[PDB]
Design an enzyme around this catalytic site. Structure first.
Site, PDB file in Angstrom:
ATOM      1  N   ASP A 156     -10.694  -2.792  16.152  1.00  0.00           N
ATOM      2  CA  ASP A 156     -11.066  -1.384  16.077  1.00  0.00           C
ATOM      3  C   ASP A 156     -11.612  -0.866  17.409  1.00  0.00           C
ATOM      4  O   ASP A 156     -12.634  -0.178  17.464  1.00  0.00           O
ATOM      5  CB  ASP A 156     -12.081  -1.168  14.949  1.00  0.00           C
ATOM      6  CG  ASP A 156     -12.390   0.306  14.708  1.00  0.00           C
ATOM      7  OD1 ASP A 156     -11.503   1.167  14.949  1.00  0.00           O
ATOM      8  OD2 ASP A 156     -13.523   0.602  14.260  1.00  0.00           O
ATOM      9  N   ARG A 160     -15.894   5.201  19.935  1.00  0.00           N
ATOM     10  CA  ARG A 160     -17.076   5.144  19.079  1.00  0.00           C
ATOM     11  C   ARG A 160     -17.681   3.753  19.031  1.00  0.00           C
ATOM     12  O   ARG A 160     -18.826   3.594  18.631  1.00  0.00           O
ATOM     13  CB  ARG A 160     -16.749   5.614  17.662  1.00  0.00           C
ATOM     14  CG  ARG A 160     -15.694   4.797  16.965  1.00  0.00           C
ATOM     15  CD  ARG A 160     -15.213   5.520  15.701  1.00  0.00           C
ATOM     16  NE  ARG A 160     -13.762   5.419  15.499  1.00  0.00           N
ATOM     17  CZ  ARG A 160     -13.141   4.335  15.049  1.00  0.00           C
ATOM     18  NH1 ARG A 160     -13.844   3.256  14.731  1.00  0.00           N
ATOM     19  NH2 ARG A 160     -11.820   4.336  14.907  1.00  0.00           N
ATOM     20  N   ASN A 161     -16.911   2.747  19.442  1.00  0.00           N
ATOM     21  CA  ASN A 161     -17.403   1.376  19.447  1.00  0.00           C
ATOM     22  C   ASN A 161     -17.820   0.910  20.827  1.00  0.00           C
ATOM     23  O   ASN A 161     -18.035  -0.272  21.065  1.00  0.00           O
ATOM     24  CB  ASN A 161     -16.363   0.436  18.848  1.00  0.00           C
ATOM     25  CG  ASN A 161     -16.177   0.675  17.370  1.00  0.00           C
ATOM     26  OD1 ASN A 161     -17.156   0.822  16.632  1.00  0.00           O
ATOM     27  ND2 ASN A 161     -14.928   0.717  16.926  1.00  0.00           N
ATOM     28  N   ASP A 174     -19.191  -4.155  17.481  1.00  0.00           N
ATOM     29  CA  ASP A 174     -18.477  -4.092  16.205  1.00  0.00           C
ATOM     30  C   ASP A 174     -17.069  -4.637  16.232  1.00  0.00           C
ATOM     31  O   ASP A 174     -16.169  -4.033  15.663  1.00  0.00           O
ATOM     32  CB  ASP A 174     -18.423  -2.667  15.659  1.00  0.00           C
ATOM     33  CG  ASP A 174     -19.737  -2.230  15.064  1.00  0.00           C
ATOM     34  OD1 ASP A 174     -20.521  -3.116  14.659  1.00  0.00           O
ATOM     35  OD2 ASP A 174     -19.983  -1.006  14.986  1.00  0.00           O
TER      36      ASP A 174
END
Ligand SMILES: COc1cc2nccc(Oc3ccc4c(C(=O)NC5CC5)cccc4c3)c2cc1OC
Length: 289
Positions: A156, A160-161, A174
């Protein structure tokens, strides 16, 4: 899980943590003596909710062991300690990155951007520049090369990570845990996650960075037609803050055949050279004006 857990090295006393405000579950807190400096430090804590399914427990437990196994790297969120012994809830503690996720951050700098600086530089205090964008890309590439070299697949990889700390240092988090927008064609149609599919994602991340926080595939609905075109070969158009070379790196990452995509190692060398090329150019801009 197969991985071991050394309490002597990682265990931290619960009454040494002062749980503050929530961030996302993730909570901000102060830990006393979490590290050698024996000082007070702000940290981020991920903890299980009251009476969590024993499935969510091993989940968070494996999250802790992944971090312990992966090891340390400047561009990967750093594990500081954990609370695993009986007496309270399970807690995994990492360093704190005050600026948050790269996406939200980049969006907040859209009115504070110039490709490069020239005297009088104070006209640009804390301004984002092409060097910053390329630098963030470079760092994430190194973090990925680090994770990949350890058989670790993010699954992912997106803005945002990516978290932002002081002095423009970004960190990946993450990993190994709609998102269709970051998924490679084979991941969507075959449910296959490989290091090469993370490269495709790196491509979407690049775009996010050079669009200064924009959402990928603007205006497009995520349905059957969208996935089909991804297969047909259709790709996003160049973002507004991209350079020619960078947009080609994106396209390269978005190659239809996974095997024909660049590896993170290649990307580190490439972005490294771009970074230098930009710096040289900047030295000239700066010297003649
Ligand atoms: C200012 O806003 C924030 C700053 C932050 N700074 C550092 C860490 C943050 O959240 C995180 C992100 C990832 C993890 C992982 C982790 O990555 N586990 C996988 C490795 C298996 C394991 C354990 C705890 C974590 C806490 C932050 C969250 C924030 O709000 C959302």
């Amino acid at each position: 899980e197969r991985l071991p857990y050394d309490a002597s090295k990682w265990e931290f006393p619960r009454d040494r943590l002062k749980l503050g405000k929530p961030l996302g579950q993730v909570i901000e807190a102060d830990a006393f003596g979490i590290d050698k400096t024996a000082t007070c430090r702000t940290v981020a804590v991920k903890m299980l909710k009251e009476g969590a399914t024993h499935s969510e427990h091993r989940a968070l437990m494996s999250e802790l062991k992944i971090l312990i196994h992966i090891g340390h790297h400047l561009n990967v969120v750093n594990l500081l300690g954990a609370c695993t012994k009986p007496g309270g809830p399970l807690m995994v503690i990492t360093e704190f990155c005050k600026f948050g996720n790269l996406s939200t951050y980049l969006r907040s700098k859209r009115n504070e951007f110039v490709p490069y600086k020239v005297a009088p530089e104070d006209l640009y205090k804390d301004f984002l520049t092409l060097e910053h964008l390329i630098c963030y890309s470079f760092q994430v590439a190194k973090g990925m090369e680090f994770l990949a070299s350890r058989k670790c697949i993010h699954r992912d990889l997106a803005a945002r990570n990516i978290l932002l700390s002081e002095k423009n240092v970004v960190k990946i988090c993450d990993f190994g845990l709609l998102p269709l927008k970051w998924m490679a064609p084979e991941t969507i149609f075959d449910r296959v996650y490989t290091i090469q599919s993370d490269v495709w994602s790196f491509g979407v991340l690049l775009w996010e960075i050079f669009s200064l926080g924009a959402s990928p595939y603007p205006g497009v609905k995520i349905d059957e037609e969208f996935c089909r075109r991804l297969k047909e070969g259709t790709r996003m158009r160049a973002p507004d803050y991209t350079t020619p070379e960078m947009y080609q790196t994106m396209l390269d990452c978005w190659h239809g055949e996974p095997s024909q995509r660049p590896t993170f190692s290649e990307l580190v060398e490439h972005l490294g050279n771009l970074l230098q090329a930009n710096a040289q150019q900047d030295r000239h801009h700066h010297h003649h004006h």
